[PDB]
Design a protein around this ligand. Structure first.
Ligand code: 0I3
Ligand code: OGA
Ligand code: FE2
Ligand code: FE2
Lengths: 277, 267
């Protein structure tokens, strides 16, 4: 297994092969320069006023003192919720990853990944560690989550670009963390995206440049799992402008399981019916 | 199958749950409370009842939306929270409401298939019988539960069976005989089934169910009016999905960005 840089027009069966083989890859030109600049324009004041460091106390202390990870992106970015969440590559991969086992999937969470100059290396980790059921899951099973880390600024070795350990997703539970010397930094242009299944060991690097390294992420997981981020605080007019696909992603529609059982229902009917969506 | 009084110590009930997989708590509710839920539900659906001579109806929604007693009193029942705290707490942290249904077997209904309640969790095929349950059901009886009217039957000890084990034989199913107000405790791994109602009258009752906070509930209560959410207790607000949940590792799920959902919605 190795790091792979594939173009946008890669066949889907080739991408899922690399995900099955190496557990990660980079899709170049995942977004265009227009979407990158629009996302930066919408979250500029948000991230600037956000305070560096975690917001609350939890066990996985992987938020550095010089790191900003604001979420709430569907609420603070129109391009995020109207276009980014409808990205065909995300839904093409998510359908083949969760479909045959869980049925529907929806949005788990998504945050800005902002590395201030001088930030040290993030601890190497798997994204699904905050799932208690990850101890039950064998590495042959489908992943509990998948992440889409999109570069807004450049991602270099020196400015703290994300590093992955290809092949570490196939390790059995309890396997020790990969050594730092085994981490492989990811080189990305603005708009490129690194695909991170919940089982791939990875971490942010140290930002040893004079300029911040900023990315932003989306993540999806099976519909039977509670998302880290709710969206019932969003204004009603926002939901009605969302596509039906994004409405389901953000928790406003009933979800169907793989055997046609429904969860997230309003009584016995659909949640969208009782709300008038 | 154990029948225990209401004042049974919590440690005793959890011990019988671990060993037998089910039991009944007699007088779980007073007969008044169970009756009020039905009356409030009937007053909600407002089905047309024809009189003896000639001379605005809603479909059934969530039980917490239909019945004020259900969402304000039944969902705050200390016995359910005492059991859910000890079954989900150490492993999962928070728990919340999974789903609730009105259980009415009309006269003539055949025997329901024997099943486990956690069969619709795909992750049930990774769980070991000694692991904590994925969900727990509390079935409260409004009418009497008898053999003839199709009262629920259980197979004690079948919760320890390996995954893939065959369903228990019908000859080895134990009928649960409950008076109005009692409640049958059904963890997700207990093999059970409703019986055949061979009497002339309905078998009435309802159920609540809870599961770990990291699992998506069967029912969403997002359509509930804001006035109803505000009058709920903070415990019930979290139960019905209006509050941020805390995992065992103190990582929060169901947040509003990085903060709490109840703070963003002004609860
Ligand atoms: C910083 C920390 C503690 O670091 C960790 O080591 C491990 C896991 C989490 C709890 C992150 C913080 C929030 C999460 C949640 C989310 C669904 C969406 C967030 C995101 O977009 O990037 C971080 C994401 C993550 C990709 C990883 C996961 C993900 O699954
Ligand atoms: O910021 C990055 O490059 C990578 N961040 C993470 O993996 C995280 O925050 O979980
Ligand atoms: Fe991560
Ligand atoms: Fe059942």
């Amino acid at each position: 297994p190795q790091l792979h840089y594939v173009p946008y027009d890669t066949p889907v069966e080739d991408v899922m092969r690399i995900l099955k083989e190496s557990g990660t890859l980079v899709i170049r030109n995942f977004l265009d320069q227009n979407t990158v600049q629009k996302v930066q324009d919408e979250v500029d004041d948000y991230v600037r006023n956000w305070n560096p460091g975690p917001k609350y106390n939890h066990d996985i202390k992987n938020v550095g003192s010089k790191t900003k990870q604001p979420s709430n992106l569907s609420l603070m970015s129109k391009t995020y919720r109207c276009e980014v969440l409808n990205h065909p590559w995300m839904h093409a991969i998510c359908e083949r990853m969760f479909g045959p086992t869980y049925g529907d999937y929806w949005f788990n969470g998504g945050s800005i990944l902002h590395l201030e100059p001088g930030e040290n290396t993030q601890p190497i980790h798997q994204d699904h560690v905050f799932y208690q059921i990850s101890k039950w899951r064998r590495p042959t099973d489908p992943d509990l989550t998948i992440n889409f880390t999109m570069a807004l600024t450049e991602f270099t070795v020196e400015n703290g670009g994300t590093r992955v350990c290809p092949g570490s997703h196939l390790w059995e539970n309890g396997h020790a963390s990969p050594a730092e010397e085994d981490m492989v930094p990811v080189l990305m242009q603005p708009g490129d995206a690194l695909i991170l299944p919940g089982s791939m060991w990875h971490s942010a690097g140290a930002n040893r440049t004079s300029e911040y390294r900023r990315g932003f992420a989306t993540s999806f997981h099976p519909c039977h799992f509670t998302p880290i981020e709710s969206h019932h605080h969003l204004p009603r007019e926002m939901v009605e402008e969302m596509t039906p696909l994004v409405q389901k992603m953000l928790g406003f529609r009933t979800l169907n399981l793989h055997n046609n059982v429904k969860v997230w229902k309003a009584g016995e009917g659909n949640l969208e019916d009782a709300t008038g969506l």
